[PDB]
Amino acid sequence: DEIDLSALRDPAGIFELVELVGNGTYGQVYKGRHVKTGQLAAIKVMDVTGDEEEEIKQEINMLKKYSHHRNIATYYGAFIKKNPPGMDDQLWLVMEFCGAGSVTDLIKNTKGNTLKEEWIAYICREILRGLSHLHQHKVIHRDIKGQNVLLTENAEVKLVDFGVNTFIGTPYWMAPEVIACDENPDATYDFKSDLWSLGITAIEMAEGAPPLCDMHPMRALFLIPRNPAPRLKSKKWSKKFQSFIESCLVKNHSQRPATEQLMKHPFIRDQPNERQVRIQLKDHIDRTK
Ligand SMILES: O[C@H]1CC[C@@H](Oc2cccc3cnc(Nc4ccc5[nH]cnc5c4)nc23)CC1
């Protein structure tokens, strides 16, 4: 938007890098520390170059505008570490540090690598709330999966890496309308594509991995448009959970419920143990030391 990257402070003495946490949407992400308060913060480092400049301006504008929601990891600020001419400046995107890691981590730190329904129901609702916040502002998340859904040390659920030329990513969370082919040459991301990705995530939570994980990515990409919508393997799960999976995973996107419809789904509303589910989560998080 109206952002000037060269009028940004150097992170020197204001923020510093502690340890690496992982990789994100075009950039590395560190556990950072606020120098004069010792408070933790997530820091995404990106190299500022040709193409990427105006793209950087938009994510910053985006994060400033829409991250003040309780299910969106919050933007703290931005800094440029200016490097010699001819070279790429380093941009530090400073954001709220969700110390419990991703849902993917949660899954692995749970024995058998599956979560309770009550747990899954809580997380999906929170994820949806964040999605509803985004969609209202005409923002598509584009990358919903257990890796981008973070938990805080108070078991709050936050979304990261949203709304941001010839590579193909991992297919397993992609919705049929996103996969370009003969029957569908004009493939673009819809708000309802996020809702499909969420459905996959719910299985990711219920099974430790998404549908078609035991398959070559190119073959999975090929099968997703054609195969019937993925279902829960076991029949152990309640009927409301199975219905919610059916609702999320409607192959034809025109026939797929909108964000607000899924919000009203009984598997989302009927959460009497909400307060309880959160405590179970916070304890399980502490337990990890
Ligand atoms: O998971 C992905 C999520 C997207 C990327 O990093 C983030 C991007 C944006 C903001 C973030 C805030 N807090 C954390 N905190 C945090 C702590 C421990 C983790 N272990 C595994 N991911 C962990 C994320 N990460 C963030 C890369 C990691």
Residue numbers in the entry: 11 to 174, 186 to 310
What does the paper behind this entry write?
Human TNIK consists of serine–threonine kinase and scaffold domains2146. TNIK interacts directly with TCF4 and β-catenin, and regulates Wnt signalling. TNIK phosphorylates TCF4 and regulates its transcriptional activity. TNIK was essential for full activation of Wnt signalling, and colorectal cancer cells were highly dependent on TNIK for growth.
Subsequent lead optimization resulted in the identification of NCB-0846 [cis-4-(2-(3H-benzo[d]imidazol-5-ylamino)quinazolin-8-yloxy)cyclohexanol] (left). NCB-0846 showed inhibitory activity against TNIK with an half-maximal inhibitory concentration (IC50) value of 21 nM, but its diastereomer (named NCB-0970) having the opposite configuration at the terminal hydroxyl group (right) showed 13-fold lower TNIK-inhibitory activity (IC50=272 nM). The crystal structure of the TNIK kinase domain (TNIK-KD) bound to either NCB-0846 or Compound 9 was determined at 2.9 or 2.4 Å resolution, respectively. The apo (unbound) and NCB-0846-bound TNIK-KD structures were almost completely superposable. NCB-0846 binds to the ATP-binding site in a 16-membered ring cyclic conformation by forming an intramolecular hydrogen bond between the benzimidazole N3 and the cyclohexanol O4. NCB-0846 interacts with the hinge region of TNIK-KD by forming two hydrogen bonds with the backbone carbonyl and amide groups of Cys108. In addition, the terminal hydroxyl group of the cyclohexanol forms another hydrogen bond with the main-chain carbonyl group of Gln157. This interaction with Gln157 is probably responsible for the potency of NCB-0846, because the diastereomer with the opposite configuration at this hydroxyl group (NCB-0970) showed impaired activity. Overall, the apo and NCB-0846-bound TNIK-KDs both adopt an inactive conformation. The RS2 (Phe172) and RS3 (Leu73) residues in the hydrophobic R-spine29 are not correctly assembled, and the salt bridge between Lys54 of β3 and Glu69 of the αC-helix is disrupted in these structures.
